[PDB]
Design a protein around this ligand. Sequence first.
Ligand SMILES: CCCCCCCCCCCCCCCCCCCCCCC(=O)O[C@H](COC(=O)CCCCCCCCCC)COP(=O)(O)OC[C@H](O)CO
Lengths: 96, 1026, 96, 48, 48, 48, 48
Amino acid sequence: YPGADAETVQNTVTQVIEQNMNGIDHLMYMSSNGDSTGTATITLTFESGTDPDIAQVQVQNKLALATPLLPQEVQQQGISVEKASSSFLMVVGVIN
Amino acid sequence: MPNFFIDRPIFAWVIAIIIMLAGGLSILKLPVAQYPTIAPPAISITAMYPGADAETVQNTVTQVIEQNMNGIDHLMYMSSNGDSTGTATITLTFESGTDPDIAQVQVQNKLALATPLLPQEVQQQGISVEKASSSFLMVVGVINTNGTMNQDDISDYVAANMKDPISRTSGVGDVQLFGSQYAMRIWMDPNKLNNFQLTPVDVISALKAQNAQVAAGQLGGTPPVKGQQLNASIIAQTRLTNTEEFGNILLKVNQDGSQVRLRDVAKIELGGESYDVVAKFNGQPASGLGIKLATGANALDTANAIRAELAKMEPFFPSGMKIVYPYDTTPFVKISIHEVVKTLVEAIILVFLVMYLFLQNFRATLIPTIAVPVVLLGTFAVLAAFGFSINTLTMFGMVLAIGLLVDDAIVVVENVERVMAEEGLPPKEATRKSMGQIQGALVGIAMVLSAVFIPMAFFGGSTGAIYRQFSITIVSAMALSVLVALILTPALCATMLKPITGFFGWFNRMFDKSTHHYTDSVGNILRSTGRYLVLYLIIVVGMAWLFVRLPSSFLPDEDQGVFLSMAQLPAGATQERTQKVLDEMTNYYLTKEKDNVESVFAVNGFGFAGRGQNTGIAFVSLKDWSQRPGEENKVEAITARAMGYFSQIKDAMVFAFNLPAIVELGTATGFDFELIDQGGLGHEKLTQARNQLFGMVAQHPDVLTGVRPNGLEDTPQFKIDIDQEKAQALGVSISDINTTLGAAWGGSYVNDFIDRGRVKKVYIMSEAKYRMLPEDIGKWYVRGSDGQMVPFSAFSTSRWEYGSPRLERYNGLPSLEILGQAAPGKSTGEAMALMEELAGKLPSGIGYDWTGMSYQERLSGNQAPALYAISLIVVFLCLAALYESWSIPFSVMLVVPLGVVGALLAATFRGLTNDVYFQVGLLTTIGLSAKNAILIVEFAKDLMEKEGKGLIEATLEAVRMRLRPILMTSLAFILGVMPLVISSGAGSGAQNAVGTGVMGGMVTATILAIFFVPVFFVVVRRRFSK
Amino acid sequence: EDTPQFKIDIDQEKAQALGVSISDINTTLGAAWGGSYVNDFIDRGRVKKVYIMSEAKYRMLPEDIGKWYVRGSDGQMVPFSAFSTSRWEYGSPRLE
Amino acid sequence: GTDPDIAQVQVQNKLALATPLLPQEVQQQGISVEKASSSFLMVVGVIN
Amino acid sequence: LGIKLATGANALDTANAIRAELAKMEPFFPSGMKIVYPYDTTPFVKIS
Amino acid sequence: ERLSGNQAPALYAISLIVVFLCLAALYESWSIPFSVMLVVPLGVVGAL
Amino acid sequence: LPAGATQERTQKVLDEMTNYYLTKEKDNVESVFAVNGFGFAGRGQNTG
Ligand SMILES: CCCCCCCCCCCCCCCCCCCCCCC(=O)O[C@H](COC(=O)CCCCCCCCCC)COP(=O)(O)OC[C@H](O)CO
């Protein structure tokens, strides 16, 4: 949500998406945040053994219902759904 | 195996304990729902194009979406319709068993690719893809008692506060809000706009600018300057949030310098997104929440959680705002589950009582009491393993299977008791000898019942799913009953039973004399076997007569506590007239039926055939069943009385009806006929062909009855057509004219604004009084090139034309859905064939097709007889295997007509139909009668072989030994099913359908088999001897 | 933790008093201070972005706001000082 | 062994992020993400 | 129409479905029309 | 970690019950499993 | 770094950290890849 702050992002984007992203099968918890650059991140952790592909499909389905309620700028920018990990496998530094 | 566990009772107890633990854990972890997924997955696409008519919607939205629905797997058919409110609906029905999530995501992906082609207004509104085959667990209506705030305020309150807690409640898989949050509504005034020489184009342009977001950047952001110390984020927010701020928008500055603010040419206030629908609850403004149960969630727990949350939020509501529950399916589910559990417990108690009456000792009676619960718990564990739930179908499957379980336990225990009493053996040796007489029969019967029930699970469609629930439940129960009969009950008989005047003396003497008389009767019958084969043929002919003359059905209608009633005013009727009609309906319901009706949720501007201002609905909710005694207080009687009253309303076509048995599905009665346009003949030609077909079906009242459309007829419309020559001569752009007309009379969604931390729409539309009559077109002016104001009457012409308020398509072609049902006493197949024949005489370029229920009927009719043939062949092969002969099985397959006769007689006399419960009851009756015949024939054959007895002597001994367990099982099952037959309370339609057929079948089978099976055995043995 | 935020308020009434468009003000501020991604170009056979932004030394201090001029309706330049004011307020750079 | 449904879902999800950058003519014409190959199963000629 | 096969689909089932779909279209063809099949790879599978 | 700590006791209870049932089934008695199931506290004390 | 810190101060702190790792822990530490302006707790010029 370019040009927004944390409060506006939380009120108008993260809160709207969180409402619909709820009741998905094998959902265990979800934590979201929005920074001063206008970016909202919502992370949904599912039960162990859940199929990540079907989980992503359901997340996409629920999110698409929540899209028409967001600010038009968010629609223009686009919303990306992809499986997430926290820790790096490796870092490949390059020097001269 | 029985001999293995006769000497190892502890291992049998360990197995029983494992089964009990698995069943208890599964019961603790099984979902509870009224019904499972029956209807095929249907995904619905909804697109809103405000201010548009049916042709505009169909041409700009529905046609474009329908042309881009390629590469979606397992698609059965597709239908759509765009109504005059500006809403386009496209429904994609997929083959049964399709993954709903995959289907929905595929549809969404195709629509996301095909969205850039839609009008900017449709894209800005948003297109919704969602599952349409789901049903609402409950509807939570929120009303106002004081009468301070209208329904827009209530909808905003529920959206802002009540949606989040309800959505995050455990088990709530989806929450749908009936209504919408606020929206800044701007009501323009043409007189004032012309006063300052302005246009709705100018208001749209001056509203789009303000309330934008600026990426103001960052103070000291990278790449910095060497030595920077402070880094801060710049926040530039020129936002508008109040009505006063919106009224301060500047549109013009006159020559003298004065400023023309927005409030000078408009009335700005907070309103609703749309005003099409007005919902009331007993006459008060209301909103609502459509709560849908999740996947694998417990319905009762979810309902309790929702109620607890709503009660928690009660103290914080505004003044005089309360919660009401017009619709709720939890009380019915709870009553049904309790009734089934009570039936099972009563069946176990009755088994105990009959066992003590006949065997006369407590040690024997305790054994079935231990055996049957083990089988039930194992059945629950198996259901859990198969992904099933605890719903009406599986519960009634258990109730129907409670006959096989008690039959198995009774057979084993009674055989052991008879062996002990007659041969004077100890319990262990008597059990070992007894299990050697029936252990092969139990396996043969397991195979035979598997063959009888499994093929029923291979049907297709909605009926396929309904039959699969019953088939899996009953087959699992029977398999566990047979496994337990070979493992546990032999051990219990070996260890528990002890070696072997008054009322019991009298009963014993009476039963001994009865058995003597019965054996004498059978002996007399076997001397004239030829005479009684004619009686068997007469009975079979009567069975065929009753079966052909028995009306067919799908499921019995039930009193769920609620029913519907919808009005339909003539074409052109407005919202006030429909509200008057709905108020009359509500007054009738709350005055005449005050002792039956608890609330009326009158939804104005809504409908099922088609939305509009001239239609309405009322979800009448009745009181608790305990407050509605008698048949006069049920839903059917209330509906009939209302129909009697509503026929006098000479203002609308008001008629009430009950809900379907499965709301997920539709009526499921009659046929669904679509009249497609396969030659591009237009709407007029298609309507003429539909009228011609209606004229044709009117000539066959004996085959087709109640054939009617499922859509709205053509209605008058106001045609205003701009004149290009005059518009250009006066220097008026067509874009300006179209924007002015659309924004003034249909409304425009300009941009959004942030109020109380929520992004809310901004709408501009004319004030009500300036867009009501054809004479109001001349009140609106559009600015010319030179700055002069030109009225719509100087370059436009107006006339009244005709057009459809709701257009339809089927599989991408224009369509006209036609509904109806077959005349009494005629199968729906004949009505479908007649409709196909009559639709073939219609003009060239006009086709047809069958949708929904008719689709499923074709699919299942393609399957009906092959499964029966396979079942019969497999049963015959299993019986030939068991009896070691190709001819003996016919003495066991000829008992099938015996129980069916009784089932048909009971259904006919009681005036029931051939619904699904009837078929399942028939199958269980056939299975149990076949079990009895199998045991009789096997005992006779074993006597005739091992002990070298004669044919007649062996038959007589077999029937004498088998009489008692047959009577015990029949009495126990009949008594255990009698409450279902007599039940007439809540959800008693399914109970009666399940119980009456079973009771009649058991009565006739018990009376007839004991006298006919020996006849069949003797005749077959005589015929095929050498 | 909470960070200072340089809130700048645009007096629209004064903006039209001097004949300066709000759209022009927004575009000038965004492009000058936050940088604007205009379009792409081909660099050695790879598509890369084109960015426009103020030089570092002109977007550092709060008084650098008044160094930026926006053309009025009649073609006369107007500084941001003539139709805007700014203040410092605290806020959260990232809410959770 | 890859699931074609999930493969198409992921491909289209990644495409949805690049679509805003494409020209307007491309989007107006319409982008299609089919799960098929370069070879033809069959051809159905129609003549008068 | 050059028909391609969705990945993971059965060629013979798809060909049967297409040939059954066309049978619903022939009745409405304007006089002179005729469906001709100049290329098909499923008959080889069936006959082999 | 909280989930593991919460579900630890049920694991021990079900494991002990299953071992007792298996011993009773194998040894055809309710008393020999008891004689064998009283030795578990003698190993757990050592582990602790 | 404190709220409102700039890139230079974070880079100075990261340089201190790298110098410590490569001087005090030169026996155990082999390489330090200091990324300025990046973190797992949100982005910013005060983080590294
Ligand atoms: C202790 C635990 C025990 C648990 C046991 C549970 C077992 C339950 C398993 C049940 C699993 C079924 C799920 C399937 C669901 C998808 C079905 C798809 C529909 C199409 C099928 C039509 C068909 O395939 O149906 C005909 C096919 O055969 C048959 O039913 C087979 C009959 C099986 C007999 C079993 C006997 C076992 C005892 C032997 C000792 C073919 O005929 P068609 O119906 O296709 O059409 C006919 C027209 O000629 C053309 O239309």
